[PDB]
Every structure is written in C-alpha cells, then in structure tokens.
Amino acid sequence: PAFGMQRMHYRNGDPQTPFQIAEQQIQNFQVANWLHFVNNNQFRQVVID
C-alpha cells in the first residue's frame, strides 16, 4: 500500500518467503536493502574456545 502494488498472490508451499519475492518486485534502495539484509541474515557458525 505504500507503493500501490498488487496485494499478493501467495501460495502456501511457496519456497520463497514473501520478503524474497518482495526484494525483486519493488524499486526503492532503502526497503530493498533492508529486505536483502533480512533474507540473507543467518548465524555464523564458528569454533571458539
């Protein structure tokens, strides 16, 4: 609604979580970079001590 985009047509078993398919539909640097961080966030597995 902040960009007049179509609401969504979301399958249940879609492998892409909606922030993945949102990253590649809307066109704004800030929101898209935010979603990029969210999607590609993960723990860093590392052996310490």
Partner: protein, 49 residues
C-alpha cells in the same frame, strides 16, 4: 384335438444364476485429505494462505 406328442416341447433355460439389484454396495470409497485436493489442472484448490 389334443395331440399329446405334438403338444409336447422342451424348454431351455440357464441353471442357477443369482440376481443383484443394488450395485454400488460392493464399492468402498474414501477421499484423500481435502486440503491436498486438486482440480482438473493438477493445481490445488484453496491454497491461498
């Protein structure tokens, strides 16, 4: 006049059949789980979630 020999006949028939009126009684049916129920296009119905 009653001619006995000429009035005599042999009657053909089957031997020991059996008749069934209802027919869908021997069937035992069940649906798949309705959430994974699919239309003609092999694409699920009521999947928007």
């Amino acid at each position: 006049q009653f001619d006995f020999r000429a009035s005599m006949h042999m009657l053909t028939s089957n031997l020991t059949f059996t008749v069934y009126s209802d027919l869908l009684a021997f069937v035992s049916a069940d649906t798949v789980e309705p959430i994974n129920a699919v239309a003609f296009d092999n694409m699920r119905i009521m999947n928007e979630l």
